[PDB]
């Protein structure tokens, strides 16, 4: 019974648990993505103001 | 030039927030550490995990 | 000189509008962060992209 329990617990965990390494890799990729996106948006914010030159 | 709207900025916002909910669920999922936290991720996996939890108890 | 039509103004406005068009076209693919988001840019590349994405999933 104890061997059965350890095997089934391992299988359930690896089914239910997630791998932290891929989690943090994806988190870093997404964090850099959103930072680039918001800097992008801030840069794009001023683009329409260029036409104010010939007011 | 057309100044009443900035559609490009709106689309950038759209992709930004669309990534925002994904990064939010990612953050909660590694905070819990579980790849399944609420239904919709994998209901079959959730049911199997519950069955195995009952089994181990 | 003829004042009823400013040809130079027309040319400047035309080149200006095209320039802003590709500025928006480049800025949107910055926004997605991806080389192609809208069709027409590379249909073959797009199709290979979905093929590879399905394969990796």
TrEMBL record, chain A:
Q: Where in the cell is it found?
A: Periplasmic flagellum; Periplasm
Which stretches make up the Flagellin C-terminal domain? Answer: 1-55
Membrane-crossing residues? none
Source organism, top-level taxon? Bacteria
Q: What task does this protein carry out?
A: Component of the core of the flagella.
Q: Which family does it belong to?
A: Belongs to the bacterial flagellin family.
Q: State the protein's name.
A: Flagellin
Q: Which organism is the protein's source? A: Leptospira biflexa serovar Patoc (strain Patoc 1 / ATCC 23582 / Paris)
> What gene is behind this protein?
flaB2
Portion of the parent chain present: 226 to 280 of 281
